Amino acid sequence: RGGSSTDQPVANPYNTKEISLAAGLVQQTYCDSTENGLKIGDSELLYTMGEGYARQRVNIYHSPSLGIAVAIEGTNLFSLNSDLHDAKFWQEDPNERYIQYYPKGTKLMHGFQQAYNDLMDDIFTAVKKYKKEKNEKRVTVIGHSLGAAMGLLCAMDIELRMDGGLYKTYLFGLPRLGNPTFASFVDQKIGDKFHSIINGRDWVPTVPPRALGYQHPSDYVWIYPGNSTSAKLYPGQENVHGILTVAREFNFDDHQGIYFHTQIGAVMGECPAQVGAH
């Protein structure tokens, strides 16, 4: 609790076709998306907002396997290896909309919370529209990169504040989001709903750093080598045996790589996204 799990890596328990799929659903947030009727894996694109310039694109899909799926783009509205003194990187209390639901002393990174906050009323409205419209009780939140941290917060919000709560969340290249209190609270509200997938030598999962008071929730699955299908699960928070044991590269190569046969290539990858293409 605040610590670093020393536990041994296990086989990857996650459903890889669902990981594959969610990757597709999020790659698509980098493409224009009221291309109406669009189809990605088992999924129908239902709705879209934002555009990746002032807010992240968010796509709402419907999926037989993942329910109503909310995907949050993670383009670089701001930069994660810029000057770690900027207001973007400061910890702050939960927004007043949902502070009532969190332990006391939950801190969340500003850049991520502000960016979720400019989308949260619309997301909620849209998620309710299409739940009612498709008689669907499962809500899946997906994000990549900056969208991954936003997605974590969104997934928490949905669990706490939305009726029916959360089905699952798949989170790719998840930057850190909250303090140890936040990370532990995630473990307990959505621990078993939580899926954090890291590819190769990706650096993003290491920022903002722990020195500033940030802590990942428990477990990720780490795909090494990058773009392969070998993956162990590294359990507990901030597992000493994981990603840091291999040099991080300081570009977005692995970051924008192949996650169980689907490439999340971002602005420069597949549009529309192609589930299973690789």
Ligand X SMILES: *[C@@H]1O[C@H](CO)[C@@H](O[C@@H]2O[C@H](CO)[C@@H](O)[C@H](O)[C@H]2NC(C)=O)[C@H](O)[C@H]1NC(C)=O
Residues with catalytic annotation? 145, 202, 255
DSSP 151: H
**Using the rule CB under 6 A, is 200 a contact of ligand X?**
yes
Interior CA angle at 246 toward 232 and 81, to 5°?
A: 110
Name residue 108's amino acid: L
Minimum Å gap between C-beta 64 and ligand X is: 28
The distance of closest approach from Cβ of residue 203 to ligand X in the complex, given in angstroms and rounded to an integer, is 13
Binders of ligand MAN among residues 4 to 63 (CB under 6 A) are 6-7
Kindly state whether residue 121 participates in binding ligand MAN, applying the rule CB under 6 A: no
Using CA atoms, how far apart are residues 205 and 3, in angstroms rounded to an integer?
A: 17
Smallest gap, in angstroms, from Cβ of residue 185 to ligand X? Answer: 34
Q: If binding is defined by CB under 6 A, does position 248 make contact with ligand X?
A: no
Residue 273 Cβ, how far from ligand X at the closest point, in Å?
12
Determine if 254 is a binding residue for ligand X (CB under 6 A).
yes
CA 128/CA 124 separation, integer angstroms: 6
User: Rounded to an integer, what distance in angstroms lies between the CA atom of residue 205 and that of residue 148?
Assistant: 10
Residue 74, binding choice from ligand MAN, ligand X, none, Cβ under 5 to 8 Å by partner class = none
Rounded-to-integer distance, Cα 109 and Cα 130, Å: 30
269 touches which of ligand MAN, ligand X, none (CB within 5 to 8 A by kind)? ligand X
Q: Are 119 and 95 in contact (CB under 8 A)?
A: no
Cβ distance to ligand X smaller for residue 14 or 252: 252
| Extended strands (E) in the chain | 10-11, 39-40, 43-49, 58-63, 67-72, 91-92, 108-109, 139-144, 168-172, 194-199, 218-223, 231-237, 258-259, 262-263
Told to check if 15 binds ligand X by CB under 6 A, we report no
Choose among ligand MAN, ligand X, none what residue 226 binds, the Cβ cut-off being 5 to 8 Å by kind. Answer: ligand X
Nearer to ligand X, 140 or 256 (CB): 256
List the single partner that 14 binds among ligand MAN, ligand X, none, CB under 5 to 8 Å by kind. Answer: none
**Integer Cα distance of 211 and 57 in angstroms:** 31
Residue nearest to ligand X (CB): 226
**Residue 127 near residue 163 (C-beta atoms within 8 A):** no
- Give yes or no for residue 192 binding ligand MAN (CB under 6 A): no
How far apart CA 2 and CA 116 sit, in angstroms, is: 25
Part in contact with ligand X (CB under 6 A); list of ranges 87-95, 211-219, 237-245, 251-259: 251-259
Cis peptide bond N-terminal to 225, omega within 30: yes
Residue 226 binds to ligand X (criterion: CB under 6 A): yes
Token digits for 256?
């924008």
> Which part of the chain contacts ligand X (CB under 6 A), choosing from 51-59, 96-104, 206-214, 264-272?
264-272
CB of 192 to ligand X, least distance (A): 30
Query: Which is it for the CA torsion 271, 230, 72, 205, positive or negative?
Result: negative
Q: Which residues bind ligand MAN (CB under 6 A)?
A: 6-7
Q: Which residues bind ligand X (CB under 6 A)?
A: 200, 225-227, 252-254, 256-258, 263, 265, 268-269
